[PDB]
Scaffold this active site. Structure first.
Site, PDB file in Angstrom:
ATOM      1  N   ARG A 271       0.840  -1.187   0.000  1.00  0.00           N
ATOM      2  CA  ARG A 271       0.000   0.000   0.000  1.00  0.00           C
ATOM      3  C   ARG A 271       0.885   1.251   0.000  1.00  0.00           C
ATOM      4  O   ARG A 271       1.756   1.414   0.881  1.00  0.00           O
ATOM      5  CB  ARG A 271      -0.938  -0.029   1.196  1.00  0.00           C
ATOM      6  CG  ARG A 271      -1.786   1.211   1.350  1.00  0.00           C
ATOM      7  CD  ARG A 271      -2.386   1.238   2.710  1.00  0.00           C
ATOM      8  NE  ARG A 271      -3.146   2.455   2.890  1.00  0.00           N
ATOM      9  CZ  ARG A 271      -2.936   3.319   3.875  1.00  0.00           C
ATOM     10  NH1 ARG A 271      -1.998   3.076   4.795  1.00  0.00           N
ATOM     11  NH2 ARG A 271      -3.678   4.414   3.945  1.00  0.00           N
TER      12      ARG A 271
ATOM     13  N   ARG B  85      -4.787  18.977   7.845  1.00  0.00           N
ATOM     14  CA  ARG B  85      -3.594  18.824   8.702  1.00  0.00           C
ATOM     15  C   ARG B  85      -3.199  20.123   9.352  1.00  0.00           C
ATOM     16  O   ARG B  85      -3.399  21.210   8.800  1.00  0.00           O
ATOM     17  CB  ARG B  85      -2.386  18.257   7.931  1.00  0.00           C
ATOM     18  CG  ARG B  85      -2.643  16.879   7.337  1.00  0.00           C
ATOM     19  CD  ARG B  85      -1.385  16.081   7.043  1.00  0.00           C
ATOM     20  NE  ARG B  85      -1.743  14.694   6.729  1.00  0.00           N
ATOM     21  CZ  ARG B  85      -1.580  13.659   7.560  1.00  0.00           C
ATOM     22  NH1 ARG B  85      -1.011  13.836   8.754  1.00  0.00           N
ATOM     23  NH2 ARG B  85      -1.957  12.436   7.187  1.00  0.00           N
TER      24      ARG B  85
ATOM     25  N   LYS C 237     -12.888   3.492   0.575  1.00  0.00           N
ATOM     26  CA  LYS C 237     -12.656   3.516   1.994  1.00  0.00           C
ATOM     27  C   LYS C 237     -13.815   4.281   2.605  1.00  0.00           C
ATOM     28  O   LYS C 237     -14.168   5.335   2.126  1.00  0.00           O
ATOM     29  CB  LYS C 237     -11.325   4.184   2.361  1.00  0.00           C
ATOM     30  CG  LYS C 237     -10.185   4.011   1.402  1.00  0.00           C
ATOM     31  CD  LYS C 237      -8.853   4.094   2.102  1.00  0.00           C
ATOM     32  CE  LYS C 237      -8.582   5.406   2.839  1.00  0.00           C
ATOM     33  NZ  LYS C 237      -7.193   5.866   2.668  1.00  0.00           N
TER      34      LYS C 237
ATOM     35  N   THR D 154      -6.359  -0.587  10.121  1.00  0.00           N
ATOM     36  CA  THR D 154      -5.922   0.444  11.058  1.00  0.00           C
ATOM     37  C   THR D 154      -5.832  -0.018  12.484  1.00  0.00           C
ATOM     38  O   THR D 154      -6.800  -0.490  13.079  1.00  0.00           O
ATOM     39  CB  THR D 154      -6.784   1.730  10.967  1.00  0.00           C
ATOM     40  OG1 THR D 154      -6.856   2.123   9.596  1.00  0.00           O
ATOM     41  CG2 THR D 154      -6.167   2.858  11.759  1.00  0.00           C
TER      42      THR D 154
HETATM   43  K   LIG Z   1      -4.389   8.180   2.741  1.00  0.00           K
HETATM   44 MN   LIG Z   2      -8.256   7.565   6.682  1.00  0.00          MN
END
Ligand SMILES: [K+]
Ligand SMILES: [Mn+2]
Ligand SMILES: [K+]
Ligand SMILES: [K+]
Ligand SMILES: [K+]
Ligand SMILES: [Mn+2]
Ligand SMILES: [Mn+2]
Ligand SMILES: [Mn+2]
Lengths: 512, 517, 517, 491
Positions: free
Chosen positions: A60, A107, A252, A310
């Site tokens: 990934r 961010r 996702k 995760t």
């Molecule tokens: K990402």
């Molecule tokens: Mn994420």
């Protein structure tokens, strides 16, 4: 007995549980594919070699960090590590490469640490000058509309939702907030705005660039971040362009809206990622497990790959052994019915990337043997609608036959992976050995539990029938070599009446 | 919808029942084969033709009556009636022939100047049962002769003697030197040569008498396909049948008829050793209490279903039809429930052997079986069979279950199988597909014996082998399809499952294919 | 073991079937109530006494025949037979009385010179069916007259016309200026004034004629317990019955008989509005194809089981016994399968009304029902009912299911319920306990009507109320136990479940207790 | 809808999963009891008050550390914190106290063990408290140190390096540890537990039936009341589990040690097997260790920890534990609040339909009127979505028999026995209420007041609202062992 067979023969789920045996050694290739995130810890060719050997099936690339040049180096090293084992076609392990999209992230600004004191006043700015002037009472963020979208009383999570902020006045040059949860804050950290409608696009100018990049370097799979509705994947498809229909798109699911519009999103995607990280910040942490188990169930039903992601082994970022909760997390992902399990910190930056991969491998094998196929198979058949597509019809037939003789494997010829998929859709216990000429399809098939791709290199024979037989034979031999099949095993072979994809329709029982 | 499909999609048996629909027309060949007993009513070639047309699949010769010459004429007439349809191979219906054994029966004598005359055994009177050879023909209201010398030696005082389908009832009070002094417990009107039953008495008569053996040899010589073996009490009984059948007759399927308590009790041992079973309700219904037969019937059918062996339900399924053009409401439900129980074949006796409506009787079993076949809750049925049946390593079984599964997933109209001895058609039907099993074979005999297995429709294939084996295989499969189309089993657009093998000769079935019509 | 317990402990329905045991003696009161039709064979007090002893629970008066006076005599004799056993309250068996309505019957005329004589309609011959007023009396082998002028207008060329129980079959080959020129499809001996049916042809006679209304008012005045309402085609049909029954008769349970296609199709609406259902096979089997009745039967029984309402199976369950001392094998299995289907009651008509063996007939339904009841696979049955039945807030239901559950867990011999209107007894049987439901009541009528619910055994309680209510409750429970002991329902050491209420009056059941005997 | 009802009405387990809804708010008291280990972070009365408020039901004293005096202070503080709510009998929450035995541990003495280097056992010298170590580890044997983080291969060689601290757990699988299950200290510790009226013994390193017999002997006669929970911490224990369960009041899936004694890959199998078996036997089972470790240090759990808790509940655990999280970490109350939040979600997601079916189906017939009433009550409860089943109970046994069938309605147990009220926390779904009034003259009245008491307490804590139905379970005469009545009442 082995493979938790006494447990498999149980008449109820409870009796099943009651018969799980810690001394029943698994005895089968592990079917759950492991996705490993590439980072400083896992980027060197020699390391990659170790990781492949240990079980990695998908690399990934996280486009949230690193430049194009940086990811090109990653691709180049993976491909090198992978092709170092081409010396023996019977043993060669294909490795997929998944581009993970940045998406509408937010961010903080720019190895030092400020401390946000609980109860104190913190100001959030998007003024370009404060872009590095970050401090205990000022955090700068890279999303200019933050000020337009988080109202008074709104929450602002920072750093894996470990920091938390309440907006107590929205004045001209920023958000006047009060720290609700403090924490030691660092550089460029991820920000979350639950309850707020982030008008940030699913696909920014950079994502589009990033996708085009993926096409040019022949990535196999897109993990598309922050997918909230069907048009999000359409956009990904458009960006991917025509040079890239082949590429599997994995949406996702990282937030509430995504969870709510899941059905529409699945129908249009090739598979799903339970993106627990964000999900666990966007909805209450108590509730993720529900989304996870709901989505995995639904994918199982639709017959599409599902990824669990995760923190499955976080402590390993730093320690040679997982916590008891991590071990059970992995097993329960498999038992939930997940096609793939992921690693991030654990393989990108941690001190034990290879150990981390060996662990997902070890756990998945145990958990796979502990699947109560009896109920699983029954429920799938029972739920899946009738079908007129000869490929499906053969698949379920093949799976049924496999169960009846404890086939070691189902061997399928496949061009696009589709008929391997339709087999794994029904979760055989026998391993699905897929023989293909398409190097890409060989990689993309890792997305489907229980498929073991074999890349076939020989030029076609003159007589098509012969070509078919050499390939089936190829499967068997590779099979024998890696200990998937032993002399005297029965094997189920699935083929087709004519060349080209879409005509699978034959099932045969053969003995090894 | 048709075929009781809403009902097929139910999540429980109860919901299933709740959704059976009288307006949902069946839409499939009927899978339950019908056995018809041959008698005066059904012996003429022209009648036979009608009965075939109407649904007969097995002709039953009852060796309890008639001479060898008599049964030869029957065979000859069946075969003629059957071959009259050979003008069209695509439509030809094979008909089996089953020899039904006499076995250790007991019958009263002929009546005093009256083979078609009646005496009356009054309730409460003295009736002497004699074995004295001189009384065979002399029998009256106070005297009945019986053909079982040892009777006098096997019924104790207080022992019961049933006559004529258990409608007559005698109780032994005194034993003596010249016969059994009995008191008539249940009276009624008595004729000549009527069946006697001796419950509670161990009948030491052999399962295979000198005549049976002769009868069996006869069956070999005339190429009968199936032996319904009477009064089978234990495994050795079928071994005996096997020995008698001799080596010229391994091919012959042996069906043990279960007619008494001991037979019911040793059923497991009997099944393992037989090709199938007959729930012989007539005798069973006299040997054990009438209230209990349904239990033996459902138990045996269940067990056969489990073992994957043919099971036959028999006797009085439509009695009123011997005499009336319509069945009683119990008869109708009897047939349906035999099917729902899971019976491979249903039988007729009086109804086709002597009655006034043999063809109508066959048409009725046809009509009911179609409805009932559609009402089977396959979902449960299939689940239970898989679940119960042990793992298997025989590629033929493996392909069979695969094929059945594939058939279910696409509502296949049919599973077409090439088969040499019937075995791969049998392994399919063993799992009770709903799609019809269309068996293509060159063995005229196997084509006939296959009627024993629910849901198999045999097609006899007549063409000489092609040079290239693969082509011969295809022509056969094609033959199945065409025959299929012609009899309305398959329509354009259907999917069909084809089952074949990797090489010639029997025992190597191992391929399953999905094709569209 | 007994009661087919091994078979009860089976994990699948197949394994269940496979374990049914002919040597496992039933050991329980039979729970399926038997309805017997009253006729010349069964009208004498002394006969009635025998029939009660043998198992009759409901007398059925068929108002299709006989005058008011004639049915009054029937009622009188039943009540006499019934009260002859009042000498012992612990042993007394209540008997319900059901009035069966005539309804819109269609009929043939009186014969040429013969109120008893007979004509033969030969297969293939020309038969004129007039509606001509003159010919109501002038009938022969070629002329049959019918009391429904419109038959000429409703049966089109190529339509059928069934006569006398569906035994005679006519096909309209010409419609003419005064009659339908019919060919005889099915032949046979025709009598005077026999029932005619017209399948596919829609009828327009009222569900309730002037006579029915009179008949119903009669039923009220003589205190009948139950109306079997003929030819119920739609909800308003039962409303009509209700209106006619008048205010003096709300207590009366209404059972709609389902006798035709429309009735089958509108079943859901009919059930919701009725107290129960009769699967009226006779007519049903003429109105719709004979092949299809079993489907209507199983679908209705299923649906009733679901709704919690009594369902009756009817007609020809044992026909041969009208004439013979034993049933045919089909009749036996018919009865068993009615029970296994889940029927609350099984009926007799010819068998008890006219035949030569009315008591034997009743003894047979008793014998089979006991076997079949022990063969119910409760495990599945119970699971499915719970599963299907919606949540409930009525404390009575809630206690019932709890009680049933408790009963299962300890193989209770019985559940004993105090009940005023029968409702709490019914809610128990609704879940089909295996333990018997012993219902104790002061309402002589409720004690009778409860027979309509499988597994309820009513006990009529006669003592005057005690001063302290609680004591009155205990004496009643105790009464149940004693009666229980006496008839061999409960033995010392048994556990029993007792269901009662927090206060007097109906509608407040809410207590469940476990007691040992 | 709420409580994941659409998901409860599913016809298959798959369909069930497919219908889990994150917007379906749980709506019920949480039934999984939380066991919290007491330590420096959680010993102050004021802290304990917070932890009770947050959900703690059992205080765990870990006798592996601390003196008798030290544990006396702990008991004292708990009892104080608990009795500070006695202001209001309708709201009062009983808290059990569980003594957790040291048992045959091994720890190091009072440094970074380099990978490759020599290390003797008696930086290059670790000391161990088990003198027989030299006697049971043969050439090529393995010695784990500190939560299995260090590995030593026999004179040893370090296989896995790491940073070594003071006095840390040593593990020796493959070796038969002839150390007794009950040492002189344990016996002392147990006698201590009796004197201070602990409610429950978590017995460490239980390997065979005789081990609990020994615990029983040591507990002495002053302590039959005390529930004994065998902790399963090793392979032999896993293997002889059936014998152990039959003889114990319940089980603890001691993942920590277990995860070192057997391969880490395999624990989830032992866990799910034991929880399954306990569910079958009708005995309490505890899931333990590391369920929320990151919280020792961080205000939020990792995603694996969250799912660990939910899966323990879904596995069928009666209680969930916390150790470092509440004993030393910086977030003990937050840690308890989390187990509370997750357990409520997970509890609502249990597929009772299957669960109930399977339990009935598996559980053998029974002749004990108490069991018979229990299953009946549970069945009645399901049919009307009863808010609760209210039971009078003297020793807890009839409350237990109800929870054995996992009703969804809450089991409100009314008792006079303060101790039984505490021990009942070991059984999923039981909410004990301690009843204080003196008996009425007429027994029947005493019964009614108690049932009424349950209702009122019910109303007050929002377990039951006007118009709810409730199932009441009682008995025909006083004294324990005679439960046999079930009644349906409306609130
Ligand atoms: K990402
Ligand atoms: Mn994420
Ligand atoms: K015979
Ligand atoms: K009538
Ligand atoms: K400890
Ligand atoms: Mn016979
Ligand atoms: Mn009628
Ligand atoms: Mn430990």
């Amino acid at each position: 007995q082995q493979q938790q067979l006494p447990a498999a023969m149980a008449d109820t789920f409870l009796e099943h549980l009651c018969l799980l045996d810690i001394d029943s050694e698994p005895v089968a290739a592990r079917s759950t594919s492991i996705i490993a995130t590439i980072g400083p810890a896992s980027r060197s060719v020699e390391r990659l070699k170790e990781m492949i050997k240990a079980g990695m099936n998908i690399a990934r690339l996280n486009f949230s960090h690193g430049s194009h040049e940086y990811h090109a180096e990653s691709i180049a090293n993976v491909r090198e590590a992978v092709e170092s084992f081409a010396g023996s076609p019977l043993s060669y392990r294909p490795v997929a490469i998944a581009l993970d999209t940045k998406g509408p992230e937010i961010r903080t600004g720019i190895e030092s640490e400020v401390e946000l004191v609980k109860g104190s006043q913190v100001l959030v700015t998007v003024d370009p000058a404060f872009r590095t002037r970050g401090n205990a009472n000022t955090v700068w963020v890279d999303y200019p509309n933050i000020v337009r979208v988080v109202p008074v009383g709104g929450r602002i999570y920072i750093d894996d939702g470990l920091i938390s902020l309440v907006v107590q006045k929205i004045g001209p040059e920023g958000l006047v907030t009060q720290v609700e949860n403090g924490g030691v804050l660092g550089s460029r950290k991820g920000v979350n705005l639950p309850g707020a409608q982030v008008d940030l696009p699913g696909l920014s100018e950079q994502d589009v660039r990033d996708l085009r990049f993926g096409v040019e370097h022949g990535v196999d799979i897109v993990f598309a971040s922050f997918v909230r509705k069907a048009s999000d994947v359409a956009a990904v498809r458009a960006a991917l362009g025509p040079e890239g229909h082949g590429i599997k798109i994995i949406s996702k699911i990282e937030n509430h809206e995504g969870v709510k519009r899941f059905d529409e999103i699945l129908e249009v995607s090739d598979g799903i990622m339970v993106a627990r990280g964000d999900l666990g910040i966007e909805i209450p942490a108590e509730k993720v497990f529900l989304a996870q188990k709901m989505m995995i169930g639904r994918c199982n039903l639709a017959g599409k790959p599902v990824v669990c992601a995760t923190q499955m082994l976080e402590s390993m970022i730093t320690k040679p052994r997982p916590t008891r909760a991590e071990t059970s997390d992995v097993a329960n992902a498999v038992l939930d019915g997940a096609d793939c399990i992921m690693l991030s910190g654990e393989t990108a930056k941690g001190n034990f990337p290879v150990e981390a991969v060996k662990m997902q491998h070890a756990i998945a094998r145990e958990a796979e043997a502990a699947v109560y196929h009896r109920q699983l198979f029954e429920e799938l058949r029972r739920a899946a609608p009738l079908s007129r597509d000869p490929t499906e019809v053969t698949a379920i037939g093949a799976v049924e036959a496999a169960f009846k003789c404890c086939a070691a494997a189902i061997i399928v010829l496949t061009t696009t992976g589709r008929s391997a998929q339709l087999l794994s859709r029904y979760r055989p216990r026998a391993a699905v050995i897929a023989v293909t000429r398409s190097a890409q399809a060989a990689r993309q098939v890792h997305l489907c539990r229980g498929v073991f791709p074999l890349l076939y290199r020989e030029p076609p024979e003159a007589i098509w029938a012969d070509d078919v037989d050499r390939r089936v034979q190829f499967g068997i031999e590779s099979g024998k070599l890696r200990g998937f099949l032993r002399v005297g095993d029965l094997v189920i072979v699935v083929t087709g009446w004519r060349p080209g994809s879409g005509y699978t329709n034959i099932m045969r029982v053969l003995s090894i």
